[PDB]
Curated annotation (Swiss-Prot), chain B:
Annotated InterPro entries: Ribosomal_uS15, Ribosomal_uS15_arc_euk, Ribosomal_uS15_N, uS15_NS1_RNA-bd_sf
Subunit structure: Component of the small ribosomal subunit (SSU). Mature yeast ribosomes consist of a small (40S) and a large (60S) subunit. The 40S small subunit contains 1 molecule of ribosomal RNA (18S rRNA) and 33 different proteins (encoded by 57 genes). The large 60S subunit contains 3 rRNA molecules (25S, 5.8S and 5S rRNA) and 46 different proteins (encoded by 81 genes).
Keyword Zinc applies: no
One GO MF term: small ribosomal subunit rRNA binding
Protein name per the record: Small ribosomal subunit protein uS15
Curated annotation (Swiss-Prot), chain C:
Family (UniProt): Belongs to the universal ribosomal protein uS8 family.
Protein's job: Component of the ribosome, a large ribonucleoprotein complex responsible for the synthesis of proteins in the cell. The small ribosomal subunit (SSU) binds messenger RNAs (mRNAs) and translates the encoded message by selecting cognate aminoacyl-transfer RNA (tRNA) molecules. The large subunit (LSU) contains the ribosomal catalytic site termed the peptidyl transferase center (PTC), which catalyzes the formation of peptide bonds, thereby polymerizing the amino acids delivered by tRNAs into a polypeptide chain.
Further remark: Present with 40400 molecules/cell in log phase SD medium. There are 2 genes for uS8 in yeast.
GO biological process: cytoplasmic translation
Gene3D superfamilies for the chain: 3.30.1370.30, 3.30.1490.10
Species of the source: Saccharomyces cerevisiae (strain ATCC 204508 / S288c) (Baker's yeast)
Name under which the protein is recorded: Small ribosomal subunit protein uS8A
InterPro entries in UniProt: Ribosomal_uS8, Ribosomal_uS8_CS, Ribosomal_uS8_sf
Swiss-Prot record, chain D:
Top-rank lineage group of the source organism: Eukaryota
Organism name: Saccharomyces cerevisiae (strain ATCC 204508 / S288c) (Baker's yeast)
Keyword tags: Acetylation, Cytoplasm, Isopeptide bond, Ribonucleoprotein, Ribosomal protein, RNA-binding, rRNA-binding, Ubl conjugation
Disulfide-bond pairs as recorded: none
Post-translational modifications reported in the UniProt record: N-terminally acetylated by acetyltransferase NatA.
Name of the protein described by the UniProt record: Small ribosomal subunit protein uS17A
GO cellular component: 90S preribosome; cytosol; cytosolic small ribosomal subunit
GO biological process, one term: translation
Chain residue numbers at which the record places covalent cross-link Glycyl lysine isopeptide (Lys-Gly) (interchain with G-Cter in ubiquitin): K14, K45, K55, K56, K78, K95, K104, K132, K140, K147
Curated annotation (Swiss-Prot), chain E:
Subunit structure: Component of the small ribosomal subunit (SSU). Mature yeast ribosomes consist of a small (40S) and a large (60S) subunit. The 40S small subunit contains 1 molecule of ribosomal RNA (18S rRNA) and 33 different proteins (encoded by 57 genes). The large 60S subunit contains 3 rRNA molecules (25S, 5.8S and 5S rRNA) and 46 different proteins (encoded by 81 genes).
Coiled-coil region(s): none
Record carries keyword Metal-binding: yes
Annotated compartments: Cytoplasm
Name this polypeptide is given: Small ribosomal subunit protein eS27A
Length: 144, 150, 129, 155, 81, 87
RNA sequence: GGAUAGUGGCCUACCAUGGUUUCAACGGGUAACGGGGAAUAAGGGUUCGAUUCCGGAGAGGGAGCCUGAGAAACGGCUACCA
RNA sequence: GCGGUAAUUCCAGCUCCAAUAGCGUAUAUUAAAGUUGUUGCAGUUAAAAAGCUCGUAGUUGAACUUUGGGCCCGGUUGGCCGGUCGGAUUUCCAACGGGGCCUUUCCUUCUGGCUAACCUUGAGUCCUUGUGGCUCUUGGCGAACCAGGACUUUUACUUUGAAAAAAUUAGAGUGUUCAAAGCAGGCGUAUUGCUCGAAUAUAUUAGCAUGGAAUAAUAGAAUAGGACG
RNA sequence: AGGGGAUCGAAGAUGAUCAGAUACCGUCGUAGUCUUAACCAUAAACUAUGCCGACUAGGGAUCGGGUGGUGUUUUUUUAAUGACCCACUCGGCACCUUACGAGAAAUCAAAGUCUUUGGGUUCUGGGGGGAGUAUGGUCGCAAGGCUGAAACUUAAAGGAAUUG
């Protein structure tokens, strides 16, 4: 019968054994170890809002050649420092150091996105506006 | 098959369909029930009796010509031993392996063979003691076993 | 060692049919084996069978026609409650129009439609199509 | 458990409100009270014949039996006038459609009208709280020994 | 093969099979009556000895054991039943 | 394979192997139909009259087509001995 | 025996050595109030339930208590900590 | 994967596609996933059989003990007629279930309370030539269950049922103008009221109550300390 | 820790070879190699293939047991034996041919009787790297053994077969 005990009274062994091997599942492990709450820059939160420290041109990975224009951010609920990409041509002229940006994930489940090494996040809003609006024209950056 | 090795061999008696008979055997129930006792009175084991009465005498199987197996017949006449015969012959064996092992500590093969014999003793006994032939808290111990067999 | 005597019966019968034979010798029969072989034969999936008497547990010579695709035993005898017989037949039967799950009720060994008519339930033995 | 002395304790052991007038001369000494618990449990002769007191006895005592009636097999006779029984049962786990062997241990008071040995199946019946743990009282011994005199010597 | 009679097999090919692989198993060993004209009467012997069987009155010999059927001793006769 | 009211639906009832009673289906091109013609008084094989047998490609591949044919024909009476039901 | 509205190691005195556990005790974690239920539609499942109903717990943290049929109450008091 | 000079992926224009009062992104979770596998995975070489045997807990564990036969009773579909002023039941009929008998057959057991049932029959007869049919007390059924005494091997499974909150869910009725909903509403003499509702299902593991006796455990009589009286 | 220490020989030193040559080749030769007492517990400890049971297919060898024969060879006077020959039967170590069947294939009498999915049971795996690393526990004189993560990284890594 190769392995699994087929007897009628083997339930205990059957759940114990399945309870064991669930730990080889990456997601079950992550969710029970609380890796969300423990590790990771966001708390497990959808987004997080930090403050811009420096502005980095990031050198893109092969076989691309480019400069990816990110921002070092210090999460306000954390103090955890995070580098985050600024999408959409321009938009690095939209930020500034000490500006207050709201970052989201990249939609890789952690996991840096493109040719951009190390960057797990992206900017969404600056100074409480949304880069989108600024990038098109729909809104203007607030005074200070 | 063969709990304590990987030998798969099939060897055994093929017991006749005829559950009575031979009809060429005459004698009587009376005849061999004494014949059993007389040998147990000499000290034979029930197996030694069935073997003996199979060759010199005409006893196909004692169980057919008398309504009882050889061990019940011994029991009824008060001939039954303290421990069953198979248990005895296991313990008798382990006793000699041990005595051999004390004389040679360098024989690792004997140590392994001792464990096996003893593990058969321990499972067999556990059954005999479950079914009341051996009292509960009956135990085999090498310290006391060489007196048990002799 | 032999954990289901029904099992080795049904398997050997299936290796007959698969290898194209007309008869099979099964060992060591049983009460459960017989009433299983009866439920098959009374819907026609095997022919006449003969219990032979060794002074041991028995033997059977089954004659089979070849109408039989598969017979098999559900090895833990699960308990079925009267509305889960739907879910058993649905799982292992080729289609709703034929073939039977045969199970063990307190009303005795009987196929699933006889069980549905007599409205008794129980554990599950096997199936035949 | 008990076993003899009857009178060994700092307090006089008696039955409540069962008076024997010393003026009236009696050939039984003490007058003794009892009842039937109900439900069909024979109030055993060792309760009516006995001299023990045990106000926790279901026959000669002040406890009533009501609620659950259970059976378990005696796993411990150690503490005085009380025992622990194991009750096995199989627990159904639906996802695997199978069962697992479980058990509980039920502490229960046993009057010294029963001689309980370990291994005995015993019928037990519910109670007002007798102690911190014991909620049940031993009402019948369905077992005996299981071949005690079949443990004897050779031919 | 592919069809045959398992209920009534030929007595020739049942004769070659192992004693447990026949249709209803039974022994292949027989009993015999032996005589050595020194002695008038006849002991009954199992074909497979183990014990080396001595006759009724005189200690003589009858058969020595083997891995199998016993070799009978020297001048002797036997019937079978 | 009938329908609601009586009507035969589902085209093409297949053949069946004569030894095993198992369906012979379109793509079995190892199957066979052996036509054995009836005879009459003093020789004379009678064209257009047969006793026919159909053996599935399975049986032919397993080497049983010959011995299985003996049993089949002899039981229909066109062989006398050659085949023994016992072994 | 005392205490309770009352059963009970509830508590005390005297006495005993008991009770639980691989059928997982005990301990740890829980970004844990439990339930009715929610999301996902072959079935089997997986995941979730702070939250309109039921039950429980609480009133910054602890403890204590008056009144009273009923509170160890906090839109009651008393004390300590914050 | 596109961008290093004619870029089908960038920045725009035109045009086009999908969804549309909504559409995109992030995070979580579910399906896809038979990548957690009871149903249902895989492990020679892709991840994976412990160097080897022993072995406790655990899981598992051959076959066999009332099988077969005879009769009775009454049910629910369905056939061929319909008798009838869409539905009706008797005779003919198969089929499928239920109950109870007798075959060597505890049905726990006495001690009466009870009787509904015929071995009864006491009269004979409505009526088809009579076992088609039931009223009807005077010898002759126990179990249908009252209640008292005296006792009872333990279980698992399965059946039916009770005890059961509502909202949720499944679902019937009702035209909230549709619908999500709601539990309303629908009828006249709309001048003096009439009237259907406000179902049903699930609700399991445990406990309780009832039927079944296959499957699977358990106990029994061997120093007879057996069973009956 | 004693003994033994012929041989071969981690280390080391040498002669060469090399651009270099800490090596491959030659020389010397410590430990070791053998043994007793005690540790260690690991190998590609491999059939890279758990165990018990059943069933499914042919063939010729062979090892062990047995059975059958007016078999051969052994001479003596026939035997008895022994070795041999032939047939059958158990139980082995394997090969051969088949492929109903299985597989991604290579291949496989199991690696078959598996979407027609349930005989009993133990164990291990869940993309690659991180890494058998860290950490705790535990065993050991030690070398190390058993147990054994995560952060982060990453679109492959990998298996068999084909053609180049
Ligand atoms: Mg792992
Ligand atoms: Mg920096
Ligand atoms: Mg904070
Ligand atoms: Mg075997
Ligand atoms: Mg073993
Ligand atoms: Mg091996
Ligand atoms: Mg005590
Ligand atoms: Mg006290
Ligand atoms: Mg909390
Ligand atoms: Mg919760
Ligand atoms: Mg809640
Ligand atoms: Mg929860
Ligand atoms: Mg919270
Ligand atoms: Mg506050
Ligand atoms: Mg505090
Ligand atoms: Mg307060
Ligand atoms: Mg307030
Ligand atoms: Mg308040
Ligand atoms: Mg251009
Ligand atoms: Mg464009
Ligand atoms: Mg299942
Ligand atoms: Mg897989
Ligand atoms: Mg590998
Ligand atoms: Mg069995
Ligand atoms: Mg009654
Ligand atoms: Mg060197
Ligand atoms: Mg040099
Ligand atoms: Mg070189
Ligand atoms: Mg290893
Ligand atoms: Mg010869
Ligand atoms: Mg790439
Ligand atoms: Zn003699």
């Amino acid at each position: 019968g190769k392995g699994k005990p087929r007897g009628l009274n083997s339930a205990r062994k059957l759940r114990v054994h399945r309870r064991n091997n669930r730990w080889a599942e990456n997601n079950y492990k992550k969710r029970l170890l609380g890796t969300a709450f423990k590790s990771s820059p966001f708390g497990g939160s959808s987004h997080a809002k930090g403050i811009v420290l420096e502005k980095l041109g990031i050198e893109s990975k092969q076989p691309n050649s480019a400069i990816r224009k990110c921002v070092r951010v210090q999460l306000i609920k954390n103090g955890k420092k995070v580098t985050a990409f600024v999408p959409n041509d321009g938009c690095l002229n939209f930020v500034d150091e000490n500006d207050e940006v709201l970052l989201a994930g990249f939609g890789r489940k952690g996991k840096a996105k493109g040719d951009i090494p190390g960057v797990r996040f992206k900017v969404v809003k600056v100074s409480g506006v949304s880069l989108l609006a600024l990038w098109k024209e729909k809104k203007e950056k607030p005074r200070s | 098959g063969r709990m304590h090795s990987a030998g798969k061999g099939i060897s055994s008696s093929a017991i006749p369909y005829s559950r009575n008979a031979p009809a060429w055997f005459k004698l009587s129930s009376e005849s061999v029930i004494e014949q059993i006792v007389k040998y147990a009175r000499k000290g034979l084991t029930p197996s030694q009796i069935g073997v003996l009465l199979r060759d010199a005498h005409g006893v196909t199987q004692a169980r057919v010509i008398t309504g009882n197996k050889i061990m019940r017949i011994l029991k009824s006449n008060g001939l039954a031993p303290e421990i069953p015969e198979d248990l005895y012959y296991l313990i008798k064996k382990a006793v000699s392996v041990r005595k051999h092992l004390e004389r040679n500590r360098k024989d690792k093969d004997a140590k392994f063979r001792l464990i096996l014999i003893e593990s058969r003793i321990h499972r067999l006994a556990r059954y005999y003691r479950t079914v009341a032939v051996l009292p509960p808290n009956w135990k085999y111990e090498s310290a006391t076993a060489s007196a048990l067999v002799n | 060692t032999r954990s289901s005597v029904l099992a080795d019966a049904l398997n050997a019968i299936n290796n007959a049919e698969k290898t194209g034979k007309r008869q099979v010798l099964i060992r060591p029969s049983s009460k459960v084996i017989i009433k299983f072989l009866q439920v098959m034969q009374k819907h026609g999936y095997i022919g006449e069978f003969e219990y032979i008497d060794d002074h041991r547990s028995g033997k059977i010579v089954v004659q089979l026609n070849g109408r039989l695709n598969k017979c098999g035993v559900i090895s833990p005898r699960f308990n079925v409650k009267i509305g889960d017989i739907e879910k058993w037949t649905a799982n292992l039967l080729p289609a709703r129009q034929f073939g039977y799950v045969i199970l063990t009720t307190s009303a005795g060994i009987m196929d699933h439609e006889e069980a549905r008519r007599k409205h008794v339930s129980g554990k599950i033995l096997g199936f035949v199509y | 458990s008990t076993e003899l002395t009857v009178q060994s304790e700092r307090a006089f052991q008696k039955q409540p409100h069962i008076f024997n007038n010393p003026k009236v001369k009696t050939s039984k000494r003490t007058k003794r009270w009892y009842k039937n618990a109900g439900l069909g449990f024979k109030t055993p002769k060792t309760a009516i014949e006995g001299s023990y007191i045990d106000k926790k006895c279901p026959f000669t005592g002040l406890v009533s039996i009501r609620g659950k009636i259970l059976t378990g097999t005696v796993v411990s006779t150690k503490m005085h006038r009380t025992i622990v029984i194991r009750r096995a049962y199989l627990h159904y786990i639906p996802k695997y459609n199978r069962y697992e062997k479980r058990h509980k241990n039920v502490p229960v008071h046993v009057s010294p009208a029963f001689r309980v040995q370990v291994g005995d199946i015993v019928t037990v019946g519910q109670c007002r709280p007798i102690s911190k743990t014991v909620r049940f009282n031993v009402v019948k011994v369905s077992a005996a020994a299981g071949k005690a005199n079949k443990q004897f010597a050779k031919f | 093969v592919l069809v045959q009679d398992l209920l009534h097999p030929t007595a020739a090919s049942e004769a070659r099979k192992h004693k447990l692989k026949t249709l209803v198993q039974g022994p292949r060993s027989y009993f015999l009556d032996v005589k050595c004209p020194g002695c008038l009467n006849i002991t009954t012997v199992f074909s497979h000895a183990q014990t080396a069987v001595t006759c009724e009155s005189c200690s003589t010999i009858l058969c020595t054991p083997t891995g199998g059927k016993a070799k009978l001793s020297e001048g002797t006769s036997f019937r079978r039943k | 394979m009938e329908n609601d009211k009586g009507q035969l639906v589902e085209l093409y009832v297949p053949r069946k192997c004569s030894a095993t009673n198992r369906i012979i289906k379109a793509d079995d091109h190892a199957s066979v139909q052996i036509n054995v013609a009836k005879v009459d008084e003093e020789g004379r094989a009678i064209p257009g009259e047969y006793v026919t047998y159909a053996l599935s490609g399975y049986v032919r591949s397993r080497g049983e087509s010959d011995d299985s044919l003996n049993r089949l024909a002899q039981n229909d009476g066109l062989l006398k001995n050659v085949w023994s039901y016992s072994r």
